[PDB]
Amino acid sequence: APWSREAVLSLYRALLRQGRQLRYTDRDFYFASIRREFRKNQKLEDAEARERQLEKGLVFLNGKLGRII
Amino acid sequence: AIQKMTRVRVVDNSALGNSPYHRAPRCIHVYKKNGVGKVGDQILLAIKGQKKKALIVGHCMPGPRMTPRFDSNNVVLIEDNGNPVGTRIKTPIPTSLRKREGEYSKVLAIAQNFV
Amino acid sequence: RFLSPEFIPRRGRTDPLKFQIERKDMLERRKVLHIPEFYVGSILRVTTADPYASGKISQFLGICIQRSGRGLGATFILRNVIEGQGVEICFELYNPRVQEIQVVKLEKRLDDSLLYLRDALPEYSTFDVNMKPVVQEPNQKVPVNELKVKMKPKPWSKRWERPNFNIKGIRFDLCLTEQQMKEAQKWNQPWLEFDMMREYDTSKIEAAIWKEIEASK
Amino acid sequence: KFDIDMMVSLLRQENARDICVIQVPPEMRYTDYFVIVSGTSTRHLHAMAFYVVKMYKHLKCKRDPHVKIEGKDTDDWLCVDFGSMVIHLMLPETREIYELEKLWTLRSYDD
Amino acid sequence: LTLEGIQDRVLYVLKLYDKIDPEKLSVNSHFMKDLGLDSLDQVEIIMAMEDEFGFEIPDIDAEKLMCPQEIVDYIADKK
RNA sequence: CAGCUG
Numbered sequence A: 001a002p003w004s005r006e007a008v009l010s011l012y013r014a015l016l017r018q019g020r021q022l023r024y025t026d027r028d029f030y031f032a033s034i035r036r037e038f039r040k041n042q043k044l045e046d047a048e049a050r051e052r053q054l055e056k057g058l059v060f061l062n063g064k065l066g067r068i069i
Numbered sequence B: 001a002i003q004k005m006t007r008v009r010v011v012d013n014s015a016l017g018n019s020p021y022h023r024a025p026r027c028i029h030v031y032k033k034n035g036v037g038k039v040g041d042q043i044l045l046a047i048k049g050q051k052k053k054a055l056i057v058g059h060c061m062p063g064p065r066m067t068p069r070f071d072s073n074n075v076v077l078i079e080d081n082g083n084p085v086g087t088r089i090k091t092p093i094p095t096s097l098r099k100r101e102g103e104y105s106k107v108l109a110i111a112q113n114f115v
Numbered sequence C: 001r002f003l004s005p006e007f008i009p010r011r012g013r014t015d016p017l018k019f020q021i022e023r024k025d026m027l028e029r030r031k032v033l034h035i036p037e038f039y040v041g042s043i044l045r046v047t048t049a050d051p052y053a054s055g056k057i058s059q060f061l062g063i064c065i066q067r068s069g070r071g072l073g074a075t076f077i078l079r080n081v082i083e084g085q086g087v088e089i090c091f092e093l094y095n096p097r098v099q100e101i102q103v104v105k106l107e108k109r110l111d112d113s114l115l116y117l118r119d120a121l122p123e124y125s126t127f128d129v130n131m132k133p134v135v136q137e138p139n140q141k142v143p144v145n146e147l148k149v150k151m152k153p154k155p156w157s158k159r160w161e162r163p164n165f166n167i168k169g170i171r172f173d174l175c176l177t178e179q180q181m182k183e184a185q186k187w188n189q190p191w192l193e194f195d196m197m198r199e200y201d202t203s204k205i206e207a208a209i210w211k212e213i214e215a216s217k
Numbered sequence D: 001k002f003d004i005d006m007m008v009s010l011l012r013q014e015n016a017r018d019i020c021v022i023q024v025p026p027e028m029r030y031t032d033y034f035v036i037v038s039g040t041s042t043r044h045l046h047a048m049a050f051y052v053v054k055m056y057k058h059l060k061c062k063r064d065p066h067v068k069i070e071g072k073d074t075d076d077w078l079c080v081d082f083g084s085m086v087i088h089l090m091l092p093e094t095r096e097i098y099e100l101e102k103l104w105t106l107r108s109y110d111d
Numbered sequence E: 001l002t003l004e005g006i007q008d009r010v011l012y013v014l015k016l017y018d019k020i021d022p023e024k025l026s027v028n029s030h031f032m033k034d035l036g037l038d039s040l041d042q043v044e045i046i047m048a049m050e051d052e053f054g055f056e057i058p059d060i061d062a063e064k065l066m067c068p069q070e071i072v073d074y075i076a077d078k079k
Numbered sequence F: 001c002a003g004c005u006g
Helices: A005-020 A027-038 A047-062 C016-030 C115-119 C178-184 C204-214 D004-014 D042-059 D092-098 D100-105 E003-016 E039-050 E068-078
Strands: B026-030 B042-047 B050-056 B074-078 C043-049 C057-068 C075-082 C085-092 C100-105 D018-023 D033-038 D077-081 D085-090
Touching: A005 A027, A005 A047, A005 E039, A027 A047, A027 D018, B042 B074, C016 C204, C043 C075, C043 C085, C057 C085, C057 C115, D004 D018, D004 D033, D004 D042, D004 D085, D018 D100, D033 D092, D033 D100, D042 D077, D042 D085, D085 D092, E003 E039, E003 E068, E039 E068
Parallel strands: D033 D085
Antiparallel strands: B026 B042, B042 B050, B050 B074, C043 C057, C043 C100, C057 C075, C075 C085, D018 D033, D077 D085
16 A cells, blocks of 8 residues: 555654653653554555655654654 | 734634635734834734734835845734644744744744744 | 945945945955855855854845845845745845855846846746755856746736836736837936936946955955 | 753653653754643643743853743743743643644644 | 563563453464554564564564464574 | 725
């Protein structure tokens, strides 16, 4: 359905790896937030919206346009 | 200069200012002791017969040098208490809203472009 | 020989000594930031410190529409559209909070005052912010761009069809009838073009100021 | 120094329901750091805001313009602007409907 | 640590997670339809496995395990 | 009432 579920896996992995040592924020809150982000809106849409969510996730990983320190 | 009854061009995600109609909202009142308005001045604005408080962010009148000079008189919708109504402002806002003391930070929490 | 037009003084009766002070001081500001040659059509990116912020730079890009003013306070105003809003910023050339002003695209538009981009379609005032600086041939005349723009509906912010403006970069006959011609050409004023005494003989002052600018070593 | 670390320590000992930070890259002109915090109720926001602002006032930063508690009149959404930091206290539902950190991350990528 | 050690740790983690109810707790407790799990939820589950034993599961085999016997085998042979 | 007008 999406560009690739493997890309979703990799970006989720990177986000959560940087979330394991997320010092300034809250781990439980970030877990709830990432769940609400990447689960509800990444399940049953057309491939266009799949790619939009994928781009949202890769940006949310990147941190250039606002990093979650 | 955004006086009384200038046709305002709201810029907010809130549908209050996006309900299409030939009545583009016109300012009712300005809380500066003079009736001229400038950047970040609380005004009373009329939208579809509903009065509301609004924030001037960008206008067509050439102000100080290192602030922008927009095309039409942009405003932001703010509820009576102070919570801004919208959550995404498509057009950009000047930085100059931050300078003086006052109720102006809570609308800085929406700008995608601090131009 | 090009002299930035904010070095040639307005005709008047202020005495030279002020102009000498202005010229020496603005030249001795040029040595901390080169102000590149730029014209009333060129495109520029400006980078300015934000005293509003905690010492972080703020960038902008747009087309310069007016080169206005003389002396240490002269300014240039550049227009650009973003998200449908046409924002113009007037930047003071010699301000202590302009780091670098670089010519993204040197080009000299047909007119001498591009104030009518407020009343042309946004396509002529659109520029992607992150565009890359086009190179230029060093030892040849600057480009003379001619994009005779297309106009919005009639009620313009001024009345540019008037001939005292002498605008040449607007399409009239494409969207104008001859009726506008024969009603707006009673205010044409032939005599003023040949008034033999309004003309500012700004040559001798040019030589003197070139000597002075040379001698800043 | 009244940096972010002492602030989050005060929040943790006061045990706000949530704390989080977002960084402002130097190519954005707004501020240096954006601390989204959320306490229990308006009284709790009032008390923690008063404690943090009083500690800031007394400890250091006397030679600069003072700090105003934005939106104390409004019982759901508060803000405070420091020289480099800015902190925002949120009601739960107000925080959800606004979702500021999303924009701070997706500045030009999502509505 | 030990084979029984990793087995009981895996069982304890599987019990710990809330969305899955440990009705069957063998090494053959299927994931997708029996316990109602999706691919992203599979990555969440294997992350939950990492946090106490593992921590270095790459992104190549995260959507085929299909049973906690494979979880145990992965933890056993990865060391 | 749409918008222009010292």
